[PDB]
Write a protein that binds this ligand. Structure first.
Ligand SMILES: [Cl-]
Ligand SMILES: [Cl-]
Length: 129
């Protein structure tokens, strides 16, 4: 599924991401825009052999099992395919674990390079929330 901006913001709010660990909703919408262009089916392979999955591009070396990332962990206890669903629940639940891991949203490279320090409230402007 390719979400609209405000549709995703509303879905993320319902799942408890607004101000989760101090990150306002716009941070999460901005991260999804630049990680996946709001597409739940996005995948990208990395040089280390791991793959990033879904709307928040969660990586298989640590967070999910895809059966082809040797010596990887599965800290969210899910198959990586679950992160590609039109229902974002699994992605959100795993993202809450990632953002609690110590580095905050710096775990998402696109957030650090394209959202951090910008006016992220713009990503939710105009939306009925
Ligand atoms: Cl915001
Ligand atoms: Cl933080």
């Amino acid at each position: 599924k390719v979400f609209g901006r405000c549709e995703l913001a509303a879905a993320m709010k319902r799942h408890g991401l607004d101000n989760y660990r101090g990150y306002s909703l716009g941070n999460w919408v901005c991260a999804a825009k630049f990680e996946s262009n709001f597409n739940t089916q996005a995948t990208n392979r990395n040089t280390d052999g791991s793959t990033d999955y879904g709307i928040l591009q969660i990586n298989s070396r640590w967070w999910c099992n895809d059966g082809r990332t040797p010596g990887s962990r599965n800290l969210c206890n899910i198959p990586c395919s679950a992160l590609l669903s039109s229902d974002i629940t699994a992605s959100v639940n795993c993202a809450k674990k990632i953002v609690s891991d110590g580095n905050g949203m710096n775990a998402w490279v696109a957030w650090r390079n394209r959202c951090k320090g910008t006016d992220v409230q713009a990503w939710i402007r105009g939306c009925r929330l």
